[PDB]
From a paper:
AusE (Mr 35,100 protein, 314 amino acids) and PrhA (Mr 35,121 protein, 314 amino acids) are very similar (~78% amino acid sequence identity) αKG oxygenases that both accept preaustinoid A1 (5) as a substrate to form divergent products through dynamic skeletal rearrangement. Non-heme iron and α-ketoglutarate (αKG; also called 2-oxoglutarate)-dependent dioxygenases are widely distributed in nature, and play a major role in diversifying the molecular scaffold. This superfamily of enzymes employs αKG as a co-substrate and Fe(II) as a cofactor to couple substrate oxidation to concomitant decarboxylation of αKG to form succinate and CO2. AusE first desaturates at C1–C2 to form preaustinoid A2 (6), followed by rearrangement leading to the formation of the spiro-lactone in preaustinoid A3 (7). In contrast, PrhA first desaturates at C5–C6 to form berkeleyone B, followed by rearrangement of the A/B-ring to form the cycloheptadiene moiety in berkeleydione.
To understand the structural basis for the expanded catalytic functions of the PrhA mutants, we also solved the X-ray crystal structures of PrhA-V150L/A232S mutant in complex with Fe(II), αKG, and its substrate (3, 5, 6, or 7) at 2.25–2.3 Å resolution, as well as PrhA-V150L/A232S/M241V mutant in complex with Fe(II), αKG, and 3 at 2.35 Å resolution. On the other hand, AusE and PrhA-V150L/A232S mutant first abstracts C-2 hydrogen atom to desaturate the A-ring to form 6. Next, AusE and PrhA-V150L/A232S mutant catalyzes oxidation of 6 to form the spirocyclic 7 through radical rearrangement of the A/B-ring. Here the C-5 atom of 6 (5.2 Å) is closer to the Fe(II) center compared to the C-9 atom (6.0 Å), which supports the mechanism involving initial abstraction of H-5 by the Fe(IV)-oxo species. Subsequently, the spirocycle formation can proceed through two possible paths. Path A involves radical rebound to form the hydroxylated intermediate, which leads to deprotonation at C-9 and migration of C-1 to eliminate water to form 7. Path B involves homoallyl–homoallyl radical rearrangement through the cyclopropylcarbinyl radical intermediate. The lack of potential catalytic base near H-9 and the stereoelectronic problem regarding the syn-arrangement of the migrating bond and the leaving group suggest that Path B involving homoallyl–homoallyl radical rearrangement to be more plausible.
Author numbering:
A (entry chain B): -3 to 6, 8 to 197, 199 to 270, 280 to 295
B (entry chain A): -2 to 0, 2 to 63, 65 to 273, 275 to 295
The structure:
């Protein structure tokens, strides 16, 4: 009795941040995405939002009407440089790694994943809805492999300020990771274009774990006041190249304080790729 | 020529002064092609001499195996060889061809370095399993021959490549087979029935080879010949390199590279387009070359 008996049915499962990893993962497989409510302790999600606000204030807003994803949407990636909670607390969630290890790692080969980006995405008010897309369009041949292709990218998309249907929370399309052809989503290339059934709604600290095969896009921010802010944990196979060059921007001072696993996530350490003439790059960097 | 003898596959050969279009047409037809004189014999000889110390301090690994042993493999060529970083990586024919393979309209450089490896096959070294280089990116075979290119290799003879000292065994036209499998008895139906052909080359020659081409280092049946190679391994901008070059190459060497050589090693970004644009391997909307001070 979830929709009125007889209704058309719109599946967007939700789990507590305290459930098992296999539980959350099974929802990921079946739907392509899933919500983790309280993925981040609320003091953290709050101390974090404060910590990056000054960097966010020095980001001018584009009012372009050119269809961009930069039109009235603020984007900021130096989260580890500018936020102690982020680099010390958020990136060390064992749920994150336990799930990454289930999407990506092969047995006896160590961590099969690393970071692509740490973006804070703040959808400004009056911002047009973002073009629909699969995140794996970042790796342009991936769509060519269809839903039998391996996973390349997952996104722990975390709500900073509340995600309403009015302030433009992300429009998901669960199950589009099993459609038989992966196209771009436009009138010329997508046959279902205009008939794609979206499904929007989260509180500060929640997140959703979306596959890279899943169609989505930020909605229109219809409000006058609400700067709707997010923090996306983009994580990729170790064979793929990060969009952010973190091991050259993030200073060595911060890297020495990270875990072995987090140095691996930012490329300050190698995995069984990105080495140094037959040896781990961590030797040459001063990290034993 | 040979006497109704069985005729092997054609490995096409071009001098480094042929047009990049003529060389690329062969690469596209066969998946591989020799470029005679890719490096000058003077340039290669000084490279071989500039790396030789680090090469002698490399111990030969001998094992009780089918292990890919008794092969020295050295990757710090930029740090050890002025000739390599000043001249070899500035081959305009190398970049012409990379562009024709990897670069998209309006995006700039579609490619960068995966590795710069001196590969010295020792006397008696066993032959290498037949493989495609794109098995490094394990999902690539599943796209088959219609797949895009992920990797090409400019595989240079530093010392002569003979059939007896272990010149690479190549399979022209294996990039057009309808199914790409690992070359094992379990998965490959042509296992044991695959005809290869050596890359007979003189020093400074190279062959350009697709990641789709089946190949393997040959057996070095000589007693004296240490068969040296320089592998310039080039991948598309979205793939991760084997070597963390931007972290082990010193900035002093970085600041002295052309801007395309900085891009090759990750000291500089390239622009990818999706209506959207982004600097791949970049710094919060800016080319990484800013934060590093490279203008
Ligand atoms: C250029 C863009 C790309 C190509 C990549 C994309 C990226 C890395 C994609 C997937 C991902 O896993 O993680 C995040 C959430 C960090 C996003 C961040 C935003 C950008 C950098 C991007 C952009 O800023 O465009 C002006 C876009 O908004 C978008 C969706 O159009 C893209 O596909
Ligand atoms: C581990 C190996 C990998 C996975 C990669 C491969 C690599 C990067 C492949 C492609 C390439 O373009 O560059 C070069 C030519 C430099 C080679 C160098 C040698 C190694 C590092 C490798 C190895 O050392 O095996 C003992 C191999 O020989 C082989 C065939 O098993 C592989 O496919
Ligand atoms: O901000 C959002 O709601 C989604 C943005 C997104 O998916 C992207 O930038 O790739
Ligand atoms: O040494 C050779 O000739 C072949 C090397 C090779 O194919 C590899 O290491 O991948
Ligand atoms: Fe997205
Ligand atoms: Fe090879």
């Amino acid at each position: 009795g979830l929709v009125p008996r007889g209704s058309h049915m719109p599946r967007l499962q939700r789990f507590p941040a305290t459930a098992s990893a296999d539980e959350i993962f099974a929802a990921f497989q079946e739907d392509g995405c899933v919500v983790i409510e309280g993925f981040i302790s609320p003091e953290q999600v709050a101390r974090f939002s404060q910590e990056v606000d000054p960097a966010m204030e020095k980001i001018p807003v584009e009012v372009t009407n050119n269809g961009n994803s930069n039109d009235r949407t603020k984007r900021f990636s130096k989260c580890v440089i500018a936020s102690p909670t982020f680099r010390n607390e958020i990136i060390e969630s064992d749920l994150m790694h336990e799930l990454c290890d289930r999407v990506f790692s092969k047995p006896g080969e160590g961590m099969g994943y690393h970071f692509n980006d740490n973006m804070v995405i703040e959808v400004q008010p009056g911002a047009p809805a973002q073009r629909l897309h699969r995140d794996q369009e970042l790796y342009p041949w991936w769509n060519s492999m269809g839903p039998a292709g391996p996973e390349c990218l997952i996104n722990f998309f975390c709500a900073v300020t509340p995600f309403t249907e009015e302030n433009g929370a992300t429009r998901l399309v669960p199950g589009s990771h099993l459609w038989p052809e992966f196209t771009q989503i436009n009138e010329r290339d997508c046959p279902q274009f205009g008939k794609i059934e979206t499904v929007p709604i989260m509180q500060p600290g929640d997140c959703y774990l979306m596959s890279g095969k899943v169609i989505h896009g930020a909605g229109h921010n219809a409000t006058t006041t609400d700067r709707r802010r997010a923090l996306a944990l983009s994580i990729i196979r170790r064979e793929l190249r990060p969009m952010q060059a973190f091991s050259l921007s993030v200073p060595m001072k911060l890297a020495r304080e990270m875990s072995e696993r987090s140095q691996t996530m930012f490329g300050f350490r190698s995995s069984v790729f990105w080495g140094n003439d037959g040896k781990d790059i961590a030797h040459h960097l001063g990290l034993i």
